[PDB]
Design a protein around this ligand. Sequence first.
Ligand SMILES: [Mg+2]
Ligand SMILES: [Mg+2]
Ligand SMILES: [Mg+2]
Ligand SMILES: [Mg+2]
Ligand SMILES: [Mg+2]
Ligand SMILES: [Mg+2]
Ligand SMILES: [Mg+2]
Ligand SMILES: [Mg+2]
Lengths: 63, 99, 92, 96
Amino acid sequence: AKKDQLTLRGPLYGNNRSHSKTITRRKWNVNLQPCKVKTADGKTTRILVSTRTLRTLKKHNRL
Amino acid sequence: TVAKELRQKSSEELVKLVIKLKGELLEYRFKLAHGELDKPHLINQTRRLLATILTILTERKLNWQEEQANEAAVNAWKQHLEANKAKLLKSRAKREDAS
Amino acid sequence: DVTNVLLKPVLTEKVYFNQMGETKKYVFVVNPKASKTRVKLAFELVYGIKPLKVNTLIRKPTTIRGGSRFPGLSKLEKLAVITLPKGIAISV
Amino acid sequence: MQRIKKGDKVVVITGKNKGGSGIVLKIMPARQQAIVEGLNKVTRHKKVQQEAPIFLSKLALFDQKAKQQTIGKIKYVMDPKTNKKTRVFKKSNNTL
RNA sequence: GUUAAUCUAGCUGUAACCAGUACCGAGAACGAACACACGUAGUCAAGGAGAGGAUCCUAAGGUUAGCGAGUGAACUAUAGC
RNA sequence: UGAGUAACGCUUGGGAGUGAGAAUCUCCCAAACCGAUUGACUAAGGUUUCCUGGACCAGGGUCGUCCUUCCAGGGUUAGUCUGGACCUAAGCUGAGGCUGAAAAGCGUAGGCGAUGGACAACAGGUUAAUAUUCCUGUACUUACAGUUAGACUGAUGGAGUG
RNA sequence: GGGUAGGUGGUAAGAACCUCAGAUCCGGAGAUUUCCGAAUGGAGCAAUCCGGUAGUUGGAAACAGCUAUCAUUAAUUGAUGAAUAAAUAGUCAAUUAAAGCAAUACGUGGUGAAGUGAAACAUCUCAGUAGCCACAGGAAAAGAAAACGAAUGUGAUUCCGUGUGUAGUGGCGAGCGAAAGCGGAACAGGCCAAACUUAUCAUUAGAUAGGGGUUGUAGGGCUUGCAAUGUGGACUUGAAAACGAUAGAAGAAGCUGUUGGAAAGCAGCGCGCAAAAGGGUGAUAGCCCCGUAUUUGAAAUUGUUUUCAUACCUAGCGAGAUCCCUGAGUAGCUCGGAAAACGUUAUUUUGAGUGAAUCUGCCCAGACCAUUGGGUAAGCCUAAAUACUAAUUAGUGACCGAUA
Ligand SMILES: [Mg+2]
Ligand SMILES: [Mg+2]
Ligand SMILES: [Mg+2]
Ligand SMILES: [Mg+2]
Ligand SMILES: [Mg+2]
Ligand SMILES: [Mg+2]
Ligand SMILES: [Mg+2]
Ligand SMILES: [Mg+2]
């Protein structure tokens, strides 16, 4: 699954409304990056996490 | 004719009754296979009998199974093995004489 | 050892032809799932003669009653013949 | 109960036979038939005088305790103090 | 493993389970809508002449090609000339 | 209606018998094709079509006392044969796992998967129908204990062979 | 328990029995419930094959009977344990849940066409329709205002009529089509986070379990007093009672004649009614039968309601003052898209980026600013009216009556 693991925010499906307004179905994929994390039992883990939650992790100092 | 079976030894006499009913039911059916069964109505009854008895040994917590806890036949088998001795002995003697 | 594996004997001309010999091959029909070990143990504990050899065949079902507006199917049965030593013979 | 039981006398109200008093032998309650002895003897031609069933509507019980051996209806409502359900004639009081 | 297990050779005894096993295997039982001139893996494969499983005739064995009986015109197919 | 027209899809002659009825069925005798086959054994398939007795609505390109049709009764017998209980190939499935909006897809260990590898039975006879299966005669194998003698065995793994 | 006098299911006569010591039958509750099948010991060509483990019986032993257990995954608990010393991954064990099916119906959610219309066609419509897929449920979803929107105003949601085919929107073409307001069915609003306080965690707590507190004419906490013992339910256990559902019991009244195969018709003289609904009976029956109206009744199982007790939750008016709290990668802003009636626009959502404030606040009243006025997001829960009926029971039809 190309959704992240902390939350489950998945792709968003929309239209590729070009000039002259021809419609074409298209997908938006979340930005996934392999940044680490540290749990409160040790067990440092590597999880595919999206960037929006990466910022939240960065400010709550969960690394 | 069931309360007259509850009162019986609902633990142990019923097991002997069950084995007797199975045996005589088997011999009934065998008699039915050939001729000489002149009361074909006895089968339906005897099966009908067991249906009650097991129904008791199932209401009580027990089982029909595990309650268990040749006049000239032996002579005929002895003759068979003796003939096998004779044939085997005759065969061995011919093999050892040949060599 | 329920001896529910001796359903019935079959009496045919072939059975008499084979039976009047010396080996005295009886025949029975047994539970379709039964096996030769269970058959011979059952014979031991129903009559009292430890049998010599046991043979089993099965008659696969076929069409029965042919064309009669309600055609049907026959019965799947396992016939086991039971052999006995030379000097012994019992009845059913 | 049942208006007609095996054994009791009974007569015919309608049909080719009138006042054909006789005894009942068999009753088939599922198909509403009765087999009254001495009535509707049809000469079977087997390839014999076996009877022919008569529907329970035609039949009617036969009073035998009144001087006028006439025909009447039946009550069941009489449950005698020392008895179970019984049959009693409406235009009389004669059990069975 | 020795305070003997395990194997080898022999003697006595015991046991050897489950399904298949018929018949057809094709100019009438299979695949072709059929008792349809078609198709379908492998095996056995006699004698004379012959290089041979070719070719002609026969053997072991096996079949009566499930409409006939006539006549012997035109005409058609097939052979012969 | 076309029409009682085309068609009836490779082959004979007779004697005796049966039967109400015969070209058509049973027997006999010839005759004519097959013979690297129309013969004999089996795999694949099909699923009782097999054997005996009976019947002749329908099916049979005619008829029929007869059929591979119909009806009643019957027949298939394994330590060694084909396959499981042993083995694996292509490949299939596939715990965890990887990837994928969803279903699913990919795939590791394991497991399946013969058309192949390894494994011990021959001859003859018998019934209407079965036969390395039943029977007769002679055999071998793989386990199990108990026993006599000898010997220290030596695998879930390594090697050789296969 | 009911219930009588026959019965052993239909093509079904005969044969052999059971039964009026109360069978069959009918209703409630039970037990048995081979094999495959989510299929789950391991396989597999579905309904077959091959087993392990622990007991017991037989046997000298293989071996065979007879019992129970043996899938995976997730959570929790315990044990064990790597490269690496400790630790985690992993492995083993124990307990508890589901995995599937179907009512071709209804609900939500994801994804999502084309035919066709436009007299062609791409924007558009068909259409967020069909289909595929996940997920339940007896109904679901939604929901208690950062609202409507123009006023001395309404006061959760849902559903019906109307507003209206309106205001608008649309290659301003085809077409699409509300939100207010109004009349109605039904009506309930509750609870956490955080301030503060308690106990304990090498108390580095920034964590665990309590108290307390729930918001807008702003509220609550913090300091201090008065009045309270009570309604109230979105609700736990018992007891009692009522009314039902599942077998059933009683249940009025007629003879005569003619045609006639048979009269129940037709005709004569009667009769009964809380029953002239219906079905059968040799032809069209109120009175031949079976029922119906009516009056009744349950050992056992089950439903709705009510009463009494029973927990948990729940209650009110004031005084002090720069005290503290009032849901952060959040609301916005930007780039691409969409839901909304609107073809992108206030409002609402978001894949990417950036990013605030704290009652003198924040948002809103179709771009926007000021004034005035309304409401307090960024946390949760919620019966009722509503949609649907393959199913059980009673019944209906200006519905079909064997090419329907
Ligand atoms: Mg051919
Ligand atoms: Mg060939
Ligand atoms: Mg040759
Ligand atoms: Mg040739
Ligand atoms: Mg002509
Ligand atoms: Mg002509
Ligand atoms: Mg012609
Ligand atoms: Mg404005």
